[PDB]
Design a protein around this motif. Structure first.
Motif, PDB file in Angstrom:
ATOM      1  N   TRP A 103      52.665  -0.467  -9.789  1.00  0.00           N
ATOM      2  CA  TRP A 103      51.961  -1.130  -8.615  1.00  0.00           C
ATOM      3  C   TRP A 103      52.610  -2.762  -8.448  1.00  0.00           C
ATOM      4  CZ3 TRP A 103      47.417   0.464  -5.490  1.00  0.00           C
ATOM      5  CH2 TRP A 103      47.408   1.807  -5.287  1.00  0.00           C
ATOM      6  N   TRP A 141      53.816   6.816  -8.361  1.00  0.00           N
ATOM      7  CA  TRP A 141      53.355   5.375  -8.113  1.00  0.00           C
ATOM      8  C   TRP A 141      52.287   4.934  -8.817  1.00  0.00           C
ATOM      9  CZ3 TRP A 141      50.980   3.877  -3.027  1.00  0.00           C
ATOM     10  CH2 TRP A 141      50.885   2.439  -2.614  1.00  0.00           C
ATOM     11  N   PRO A 174      50.584   8.916  -5.972  1.00  0.00           N
ATOM     12  CA  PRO A 174      49.762   7.968  -6.514  1.00  0.00           C
ATOM     13  C   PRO A 174      48.879   8.364  -7.439  1.00  0.00           C
ATOM     14  CG  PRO A 174      48.684   8.412  -4.677  1.00  0.00           C
ATOM     15  CD  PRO A 174      50.006   9.265  -4.649  1.00  0.00           C
ATOM     16  N   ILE A 183      43.878   4.558  -0.199  1.00  0.00           N
ATOM     17  CA  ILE A 183      45.239   4.248  -0.178  1.00  0.00           C
ATOM     18  C   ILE A 183      45.969   4.966   1.162  1.00  0.00           C
ATOM     19  CG2 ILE A 183      47.450   4.741  -1.110  1.00  0.00           C
ATOM     20  CD1 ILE A 183      45.729   4.999  -3.817  1.00  0.00           C
TER      21      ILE A 183
END
Length: 284
Positions: free
Chosen positions: A38, A63, A100, A132
């Protein structure tokens, strides 16, 4: 056959690295896997995305928020960074599979429910994941597909396959990561077949009406026959895991030799197994 084949190819997926791996397995990749954190802006991903899309593949990005735990993310502390990523991915426009906050039913990542800081709960995780997705949708990034993930095993206190599931309205695919460690780990790892690794998590995810990705899988050589393991894994995927739509190997030899060519026998088995899958001619 609809099953898509993917890989982490052992390095960042440059054009050369993608080609090398395709030459090895004797088949074009459908999915190419890359890992970022990130602090990574999309401009750094850009050249790799171009290589993957030029090849006729989809990029799957894991991610990893080392920089922000689920409390930080749900509270909005990362939002400028999230917003820019969404804007950049929207502008890029191609279909991207984004993963993520992965393996949150383990205890090794600082965003995971099992992590010993005790900061991350089902509730903070779900709020973070939803936040998100909301930002990406507000910025038009409908080309980004959301991949929920579990580790094959729940590791650490409070971990479960579905307690942290953020809901069907926030998820496009679910996913599992799992490895046959053979007898390689000093903590007393054992040889486990694909079905032994994946069955429990699959049963859990199969209760959710989303397609499933085997986002990471591989086997060691030590403690059993990896060639047979490969043959049996793909046969299992076809016969008993029919909600799985993609299988993404983890090809690397930094510590354990996970590579499809960790031996000649493993490579031959891998090539034979994927060769059973229908040929999908590509053109832009």
């Amino acid at each position: 056959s609809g099953l898509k084949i993917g890989a982490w190819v052992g390095t960042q997926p440059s054009e050369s690295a993608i080609k090398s791996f395709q030459e090895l397995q004797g088949r074009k990749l459908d999915i190419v896997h890359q890992f970022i954190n990130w602090s990574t802006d999309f401009s750094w991903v850009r050249p790799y995305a171009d290589a993957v899309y030029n090849n006729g593949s989809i990029l799957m990005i894991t991610w990893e928020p080392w920089e922000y735990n689920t409390v930080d993310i749900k509270n909005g502390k990362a939002d400028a960074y999230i917003t820019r990523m969404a804007q950049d991915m929207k502008a890029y426009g191609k279909e991207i599979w984004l993963r993520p906050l992965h393996e949150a039913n383990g205890d090794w990542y600082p965003w995971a429910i099992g992590y010993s800081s005790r900061v991350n709960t089902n509730e903070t995780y779900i709020a973070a994941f939803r936040h998100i997705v909301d930002i990406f949708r507000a910025n038009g990034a409908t080309n980004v597909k959301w991949v929920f993930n579990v580790n094959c095993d729940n590791v650490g206190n409070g971990t479960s396959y579905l307690g942290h599931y953020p809901g069907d309205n926030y998820v496009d695919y679910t996913s599992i990561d799992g490895y046959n460690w053979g007898t390689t780990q000093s903590w007393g790892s054992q040889w486990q077949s694909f079905d032994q690794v994946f069955s429990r998590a699959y049963q859990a995810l199969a209760s959710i009406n989303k397609p499933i990705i085997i986002a990471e899988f591989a086997s060691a050589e030590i403690g059993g026959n990896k060639a047979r393991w490969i043959t049996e894994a793909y046969n299992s995927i076809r016969t008993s895991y029919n909600k799985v739509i993609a299988a993404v190997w983890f090809h690397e030899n930094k510590e354990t030799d996970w590579r499809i060519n960790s031996s000649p026998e493993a490579l031959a088995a891998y090539r034979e197994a994927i060769g059973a899958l229908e040929h999908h001619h590509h053109h832009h």
